Design a protein around this ligand. Structure first.
Ligand SMILES: C[S@@+](CC[C@H](N)C(=O)[O-])C[C@H]1O[C@@H](n2cnc3c(N)ncnc32)[C@H](O)[C@@H]1O
Length: 224
């Protein structure tokens, strides 16, 4: 599979000078000069991964892994943006739809190292851990290390005190955790990521014995 099949075509761009998730940045001629993210409130990053629409998904995946960046801008011969390809696109439009990955377990790809947090941890400390995690979410465990929940940035909005403060993360965590196992296929993991709109599934054994984490980013390694 090629980039052209999985990318989102004709991305909205922003031409400099100037005052979704991010917008490709171009000059007067329309050539790509960087990308700007909404979170990053020059603020434009120049060293962004780029590919052509006829390149393989493998090439785009390699670049994402190389720059530890979640998207690549697709340009034409003129170096002008004609599409955008994100990790999300690869998961939802490719891994979750292709028949090729129904026969590939995630055992060789999931992370054995995972940042977690005890459910009794005050929110601020839990947020510090989230900030220092390579995952968008922190699996939550009880006092004995058993998996009991999971939490991410969006869960902060579950705190009624935002209507305008350092309680246990247990108060905003998601209790029903969608999990994976080492033998689960890339196909099924992607199906779950797409279905629940989540970027990671804790990897377990037994009923709640945490042994790893499979992130959408980890699935890119399958393409290599
Ligand atoms: C639907 S995801 C979307 C996150 C996306 N980055 C966003 O900003 O919209 C956010 C929710 O999924 C939950 N979540 C994350 N991973 C999960 C998992 N493995 N199992 C169950 N729920 C999960 C989080 O706790 C949170 O309530």
């Amino acid at each position: 599979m090629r980039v052209k099949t999985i990318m989102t075509q004709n991305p909205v761009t922003i031409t400099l000078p100037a005052t979704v998730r991010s917008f490709p940045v171009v000059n007067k001629e329309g050539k790509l000069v960087g990308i700007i993210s909404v979170k990053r409130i020059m603020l434009v990053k120049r060293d962004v991964p780029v590919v052509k629409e006829n390149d393989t998904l493998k090439k785009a995946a390699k670049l994402m892994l190389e720059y530890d960046y979640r998207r690549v801008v697709v340009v034409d011969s003129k170096g002008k943006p004609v599409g955008i390809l994100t990790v999300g696109d690869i998961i939802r439009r490719y891994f979750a739809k292709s028949e090729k990955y129904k026969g590939v377990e995630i055992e060789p790809y999931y992370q054995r190292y995972v940042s977690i947090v005890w459910e009794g941890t005050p929110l601020k400390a839990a947020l510090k851990a989230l900030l220092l995690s390579n995952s968008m979410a922190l699996p939550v465990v009880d006092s004995e290390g058993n998996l009991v929940g999971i939490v991410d940035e969006t869960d902060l909005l579950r705190d009624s005190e935002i209507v305008r403060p350092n309680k246990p993360v247990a108060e905003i965590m998601t209790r029903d955790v969608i999990v994976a196992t080492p033998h689960m296929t890339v196909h099924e993991v992607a199906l779950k990521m797409a279905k629940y709109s989540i970027e990671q599934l804790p990897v377990i054994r037994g009923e709640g014995d945490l042994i790893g984490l499979i992130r959408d980013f980890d699935l890119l390694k399958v393409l290599v």
